[PDB]
Structures are given as structure tokens and as C-alpha cells.
Write a protein that binds this ligand. Structure first.
Ligand SMILES: N[C@@H](Cc1c[nH]c2ccccc12)C(=O)O
Lengths: 331, 331
């Protein structure tokens, strides 16, 4: 617990295996060697789900359950609800003056999201400026370390430019955050697509039963040109093997399987059955905790209402120095 | 009283003659005909003076002074410092999700301000976004009536739209404000321009001495082509006549000079000399009232502090409604 680390998820659905490999495992490690803050960004979730406020509200507790199921320790990690800390909103408006529409339009990750969203020019204001509200999140909690995939770096770098702009303009009162680069490639979906997502219908939820997990793995995309076991098959592009590199505890088995698969005679069945065994080993403890916490709804609520109290107090302090530094009337 | 009315100014310096005919005397009278709220747009002032925070801080008290000297009574008007009502920033963020960047791009007023400031695509986000920040000001205070210059209509109309969209998506807890059009269009500068402002240096501040007011009138743009008295003059484009038209109580008397001046025996000096006194007359009491308060600074502070508390009270009430209407986790 030395550097304060900030991470988070906009609450829009249940977490899945992609989040586990992409951010959860690394977060369970961080809680023991840093002070970890996780933001349930329901406000940010609203920049594009403003038409589905029920969906957002219900997922705040569902993702919290997922964090805990994942292994995030209520006595180690501060879980906070963005909605319950208005200090963030207050800070993002001040931050809006430190950035240009021009530079906001150049952000490559938002540009790509809008592209995939098909918005066109009909981009909702809140979404267009969300990178700043995130900057507000980082500075307010006073995080100095932010886990990031290269897809979020422009979010992070802008944060850096903003804090830098704020300190030089008013007074050097905000910490400059540093990135904790990557998590190695993103977990592809069950049918082989680049992205794993509920929406795309190719995911395995952390909450999926051991049976379901087995079924989902069975119908996984493999190798279009591999038609029967005797045939040789390709590893690259084949998610069954991409899943194995991200969860299989022993690469010896992994590399061995890869061998015999390019050879021939090793059907998808024997490989997949082995995937099932490795996934059930990573997931079983996550399923037990999740079921346990289900019996203890009060324990999950305590997890968030308390992280929130802490988060509120921290953000409140920062705004105090921000207000004074900005020379705001009465400070 | 009856309706709630929201009016305000961006604290950037002393108020002048344009605010007077522009609204100050208007609110002086709607001050007992309704519940009048006057917002010192502290934050909105930063989307333009984010690099000169000191300038803003200093003018909150100076404009409040201006307010009081203009005739506003502490017992009937709620003076509110924007920055001290964080609830407004909270509501602004939520409103941002209700409008598109392309819609903000077609606001004629902001577009003109932007071209004048030479920002180009390098427009500060906070500024490009100020119209909705204003809609939040309106919606948070429950304002049903908003006096508006011909010029501020786009903004007023965007407010109703957003309020409307907010009510349909979430719940009908916000009121659509209605406009109060004025007669005297934007009082022009001494310059002969369309705008009077301390920035353009063509303004007669409410604090200027009988000597100054007289000196400013004498250097006031009139009519080229009219070189000597004798000659015939014309009222179109002459700030002095559009000054008499907004500050002179005897229209029969005005339309009088309008005759003679088109003929040729009314020297611009004579027009001026008259008008200068019609201004000292409208200004005389304002000057004495200012001295009183200038000698009771404690009272100006009071006006601001008490009002700001009252207004936050009001904002807090509406936000509670908004927060529950949006189904934000926990409400
Ligand atoms: N996926 C979200 C996660 C998030 C929300 N707010 C944050 C603040 C800091 C770090 C991450 C976040 C994002 O793109 O940002």
C-alpha cells in the first residue's frame, strides 16, 4: 500500500473471462502491493447508456459482486460508486476549460468508439468529453498509478496533459499519474472474433455455471480448415489455444498440445476437453465466492457503501486544494 | 412574487449602462413581481478567463456591489455565486448526455463568439459547452421565467429542449423555462458598435464619475458627413439617439431632436449635452447607493453569502429529485 492505483469499469453488464484475463487478475495482485481503488463508473456508463438508466443502476451491484467473486478483498480494495461522489462532476467542468474541442476530437480511442457506435456527427456531448471526466476521476482520488492497455493510453496521456495544465495555471496541487502498461493482448471471443462481449454473444460470464462453461467451450470456433481429428490444424487464430495461453497454469502441457495439434490426430475435442479442465480450475474458486456472496447481499453492499465513503472523503480533500488553488471566491 | 426568475452575469468586471437598460432596471421591477435569482456566473466566467482566475474572484463582489447600487434589494433578490453551488456542475454533466456535438456546433451565438475570439477549432471545451451549463443553471433553480436578449434565444430554446428530453427519458421533474423578451435591443457601444463592453473599451460603467460620463458622451461616435452644426444630420446609426431612446423618459422630447437633427439647427453638442444629463439623472441615485454600501462592505458580503446559501438550498432540492428521477444507484 504505497502508490494509490486507480482502476474501474462502467457498469453495463456482468463481467466475463475477458475482464478476468484483461484486468481482474492483475488487480487482485495490485491490492497487495498498492492501495487499490476501483471505480464503478455509472456516470460515465451514462454517456452512452443515458437511455437505459435501469441497466446501469442494476449493474453497479452486479459488477461489485463480480469484483468480489474475482477475489478483490473488501479489506484491501476501496470500491467506489462514481454517482455518489459529485466532487468528480465539479472537477470535470473545471477540466473542460483546460482542453480544446480540437484535441478532444483527435483522441484515437474515442474516435474509434464513435466509429464502431455509428454515431456519425450525432455524438452525445457527454460521450465526446468523457476522457476528461476520467481525468477528473484520476486527479480527484489522487492516483499516481493507472493500469492501462495501449487502448487507454490516450485517455491517460490526456489526463497527464490536463494535470500539467492545471498545476502550471493555478498551483501544482495535482499528482501526475503514471501508466502501468498493458496486460498482453485482449482475450478474443468464443467464435474467434477480436472482441469478447455479452453483446456479441460470444462470452463466458464469471458467473456462468461449470456446466455452461463446459458447453460454451465445446462450441468454440477452432480452425475452419481443420475438419476431423486426423487432419492437421492451425493454432494461430484458434481461440481455444489463445484461451490456453492466458489461463493454463503449465505451458508444458500447452506447448505439447500445440505440437500434437499441428501434427494431426488431436481433435478439437481432446484439446477443448483440456481447456475445460484449465478453465474450471481458474473459475471454480470464483464461482464459490460468488455464490457465497449471493447469500450475503449485505456483505456486497457494505463493500461499496464503504469504499464510497472513503472515496468521497478523498475526492473531497482534493477539491479543497483545487478550489483554493483556482482562487475560487471564498477559498 | 409568483414565478421563479433566473438572471445573471459573467463576473469579469464592473457593470455598465448596457446591463442597466439590458436588464438591471428590468429585474429591479420584476424583483417584487416574482422570486428573482441573480447568478454570478463564476464558473462560466472561467470558460473564458480560466487563465485569469484572480480577475473573476475580484469581480464577484464588485458586480454584487453593482447589483445593489442598481436598486436590487437584499430582502427581495437571491444573489448566488455559481462556484459555491457544485450541484450545478453535477447537473451540467448529466445534461451533456442529452445533446449532440453537432447540435452544439450550430448555436449561432456561440459560433459568433468563437469566430470573434479567434479560437478556430481550438475552442476550449468548457466554452463550446457553456450553453448547456446555462441550461443546468436554469433547471437547478427551477426558473420558469428567463429574461433574454434577442441574442440569447438559441440558448433559452436549447434549455427547453433538454429539459423536455430529460422529463421524457427519466421523469417529469424539471420545468421548461419561458422567455421574457425585451424592447431595447442590445444597447450599442459609445464606439457605434453593436456591443458595449469593457473589453471593447466603449462602455460607461455604473461607477463612473459625473466627469467621466460627460467625457465618454463627448467622444461618442456620432455621424461622419455631419461636420458642422448647420448641416443636416441623420439618426440612423447614431448611438446618441439610441441612447436617448433607452435612457430618456420624454419620448415627445426625443422625437423632437429627431426632427431638428434631420433639419439643421440642432448641434451634436446640444444633443450630447442633453443626453449626458439624462444619464446623470438615471445615474444619480445609483451613485449615492453605491457609496452607502461601499462604506458597509460587510453588507455586500452578506448579500452574497446569504443568497448563495438560499440558492444552494434550492439547487440541492432539485438535484435530489433529478438523482431519483435518473435512478442513480442508491436513490
Ligand atoms: N472502461 C472505462 C473504465 C473507467 C471509467 N472511469 C475510469 C477512470 C479511471 C480509469 C478507468 C476508468 C474507461 O474507458 O475509462
Amino acid at each position: 500500500a504505497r502508490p494509490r492505483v486507480l482502476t474501474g469499469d462502467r457498469p453495463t453488464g456482468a463481467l466475463h473471462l475477458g475482464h478476468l484475463a484483461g484486468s481482474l487478475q492483475n488487480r487482485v495482485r495490485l491490492q497487495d502491493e498498492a492501495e487499490l481503488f476501483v471505480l464503478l463508473a455509472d456516470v460515465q456508463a451514462l454517456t452512452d447508456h443515458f437511455d437505459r438508466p435501469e441497466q446501469v443502476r442494476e449493474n453497479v451491484l452486479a459488477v461489485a459482486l463480480d469484483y468480489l467473486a474475482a477475489g478483490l478483498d473488501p479489506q484491501k480494495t476501496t470500491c467506489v460508486v462514481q454517482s455518489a461522489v459529485p466532487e468528480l462532476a465539479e472537477l470535470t467542468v473545471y477540466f473542460l476549460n483546460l482542453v480544446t474541442v480540437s484535441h478532444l476530437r483527435q483522441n484515437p480511442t474515442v474516435k474509434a468508439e464513435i466509429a464502431q457506435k455509428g454515431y456519425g456527427e450525432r455524438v452525445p456531448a457527454g460521450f465526446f468529453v468523457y476522457p476528461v471526466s476520467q481525468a477528473a476521476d484520476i486527479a480527484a482520488f489522487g492516483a499516481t498509478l493507472v493500469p492501462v492497455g495501449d487502448d487507454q493510453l490516450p485517455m491517460l496521456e490526456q489526463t497527464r496533459e490536463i494535470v500539467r495544465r492545471f498545476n502550471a495555471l493555478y498551483a501544482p496541487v495535482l499528482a501526475e499519474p503514471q501508466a502501468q502498461l498493458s496486460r498482453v493482448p485482449r482475450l478474443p471471443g468464443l467464435d474467434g472474433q477480436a472482441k469478447m462481449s455479452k453483446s456479441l454473444g460470444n462470452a463466458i460470464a464469471l458467473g456462468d455455471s461449470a456446466d455452461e462453461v463446459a458447453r460454451k467451450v465445446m462450441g468454440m470456433y477452432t480452425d475452419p480448415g481443420h475438419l476431423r481429428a486426423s487432419d492437421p490444424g492451425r493454432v494461430e487464430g484458434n481461440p481455444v489455444f489463445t484461451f490456453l495461453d492466458a489461463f493454463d497454469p503449465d505451458p508444458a502441457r500447452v506447448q505439447a498440445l500445440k505440437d500434437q495439434y499441428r501434427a494431426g490426430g488431436l481433435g478439437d475435442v481432446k484439446v477443448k476437453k483440456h481447456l475445460i479442465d484449465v478453465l474450471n480450475g481458474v473459475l471454480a474458486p470464483i464461482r464459490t465466492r460468488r455464490a457465497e456472496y449471493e447469500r450475503d447481499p449485505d456483505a456486497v453492499l457494505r463493500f461499496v457503501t464503504e469504499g464510497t465513503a472513503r472515496g468521497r472523503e478523498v475526492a473531497a480533500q482534493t477539491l479543497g486544494q483545487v478550489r483554493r488553488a483556482m482562487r475560487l471566491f471564498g477559498h
